[PDB]
């Protein structure tokens, strides 16, 4: 479990030397960024419930074979396990946003999931679809271009951070497949 700081430190430890000026400069870009990340995580974690609902509901909307008998969303049991899985994923993604590195996401959530879904017969394409919808809806909230809820924030640019969050969701969606 390693943030941006610990990632710089670990890389300098494999390099076996002091962090130096250059690594601290990239770290000053992180620290100097700061409250954009803070407000970004506030945006995703604010509307998190709604994201999860919409994404899984949308996933069922594109192919109704999930709710068809023999689909993995056919029962209350399996649907509720589906909803908690989407929720946990978004949880660790928010952790990955405050961290700045995907270490917590790789170690605590990604590590051992693929084997498990394969053993349980969860359709992986549908999961990557769920992750993709949570990605798009999360980037739309994080850019404040959501058409339903649009809150006041002092303006600027937060696009690179959006690219970071899209990278985390692409890591999850690439991992489940």
């Amino acid at each position: 479990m390693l943030d941006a700081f610990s990632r710089v430190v670990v890389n300098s430890d494999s390099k076996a030397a002091y962090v130096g000026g250059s690594d601290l400069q990239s770290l000053k870009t992180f620290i100097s960024d700061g409250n954009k990340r803070l407000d970004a995580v506030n945006c995703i974690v604010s509307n998190a419930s709604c994201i999860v609902s919409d994404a899984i509901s949308g996933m069922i909307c594109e192919n109704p074979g999930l709710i068809a008998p023999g689909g993995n969303c056919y029962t209350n049991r399996r649907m509720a396990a589906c909803l908690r899985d989407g929720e946990i994923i978004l949880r660790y993604v928010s952790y990955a946003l405050l961290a700045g590195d995907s270490s917590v996401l790789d170690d605590r959530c990604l590590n051992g999931l693929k084997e498990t879904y394969i053993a349980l017969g969860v359709p992986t394409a549908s999961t990557s679809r769920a992750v993709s919808i949570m990605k798009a809806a999360s980037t739309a909230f994080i850019m404040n271009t959501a058409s339903g809820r649009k809150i006041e924030i002092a303006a600027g640019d937060c696009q690179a951070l959006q690219s970071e969050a899209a990278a985390y969701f692409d890591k999850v969606g690439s991992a489940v497949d």
Partner: protein
């Protein structure tokens, strides 16, 4: 590693919650103390060699019996080794100083050091003479900023109070 954001993410993971405003204020304090702390990391990466040199030179200036022929450090290779060990210590102070907290410094340097140092007949009082030499040679305004210097003091004191 033990740090601010890993303590808060670790606590939210252990709790099973979304990261609320408490973790946000914690990382707020991280991003505010960071400017002061990093500067000390820059200057440590500046003159670590003279830090290690004065540290070890004063360490054997206090304890001469180590270069006598009982006690361990009585050969040129082991005085080299002792100097390198102090260089590892200052590098861990640089690492934990960059991270924020004591995590790099605890898990690499402190954890399990008692067995090694007790095994290999290594006295802690020599190390503490070195670190307290550096802490007394620190000064106030001339090299560093005072505030960041306090951070440095803290880390060095932590090492002493994790050693004996």
């Amino acid at each position: 590693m033990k740090s601010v954001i890993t303590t808060t993410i670790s606590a939210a993971d252990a709790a099973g919650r979304f990261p609320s405003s408490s973790d946000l204020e914690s990382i707020q304090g991280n991003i505010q103390r960071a400017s002061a702390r990093l500067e000390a990391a820059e200057k440590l990466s500046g003159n670590h060699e003279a830090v290690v040199k004065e540290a070890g030179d004063a360490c054997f200036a206090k304890y001469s019996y180590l270069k006598n022929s009982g006690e361990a450090g009585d050969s040129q290779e082991k005085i080299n080794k002792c100097y390198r060990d102090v260089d590892h210590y200052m590098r861990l102070i640089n690492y934990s100083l960059v991270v924020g907290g004591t995590g790099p410094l605890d898990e690499w340097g402190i954890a399990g050091s008692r067995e090694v140092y007790r095994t290999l007949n290594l006295p802690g009082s020599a190390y503490i003479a070195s670190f307290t030499f550096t802490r007394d040679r620190l000064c106030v305004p001339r090299d560093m900023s005072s505030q960041a210097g306090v951070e440095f003091v803290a880390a060095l004191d932590y090492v002493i109070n994790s050693l004996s």
